[PDB]
């Protein structure tokens, strides 16, 4: 259900075009894959784009292995592509996402 609301042939357009360092971001591929038309009603729907824990917040330990999901078999991310995944949205508390930042980030 990773590419349910969306298509698997859209997320790759960024996973291969943003392979560069600090080139891949959550608020950048949204316009490529198809998350630019979201509305906080499809995001959590897949519950596989924010965090693979859904326990409360998110950490860098849940970003390095992000592309690994969509991608065929990623390895690890840099110290920027990840730091700009949960520490880029906002700092409502300590720079962690909580089903509130990730949304406003894409929804804008």
From Swiss-Prot:
Keyword annotations from UniProtKB, A to Z: Calcium, Metal-binding, Repeat
Binding residues for Ca(2+) 2: 90, 92, 94, 96, 101
Keyword set includes Phosphoprotein: no
Chain positions recorded as Ca(2+) 1 binding sites: 51, 53, 55, 62
EF-hand domain location: 38-73, 77-108
Entry GO terms, CC: cytoplasm
Protein family per UniProt: Belongs to the parvalbumin family.
Classification via PANTHER family: ONCOMODULIN-2-RELATED (PTHR11653:SF4), PARVALBUMIN ALPHA (PTHR11653)
Additional free-text comment from the UniProt record: This parvalbumin has an isoelectric point of 4.6.
Name of this protein: Parvalbumin, thymic CPV3
Species assigned in the record: Gallus gallus (Chicken)
């Amino acid at each position: 259900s990773l590419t349910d609301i969306l298509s698997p042939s859209d997320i790759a357009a960024a996973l291969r075009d943003c392979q560069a360092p600090d080139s891949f971001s959550p608020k950048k591929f949204f316009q490529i894959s198809g998350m630019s038309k979201k509305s906080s009603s499809q995001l959590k729907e897949i519950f596989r784009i924010l965090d693979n824990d859904q326990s409360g917040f998110i950490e860098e330990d849940e970003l390095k292995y992000f592309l690994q999901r969509f991608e065929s078999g990623a390895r690890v991310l840099t110290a920027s592509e990840t730091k700009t995944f949960l520490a880029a949205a906002d700092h409502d508390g300590d720079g962690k996402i909580g089903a509130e930042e990730f949304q406003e980030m894409v929804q804008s």
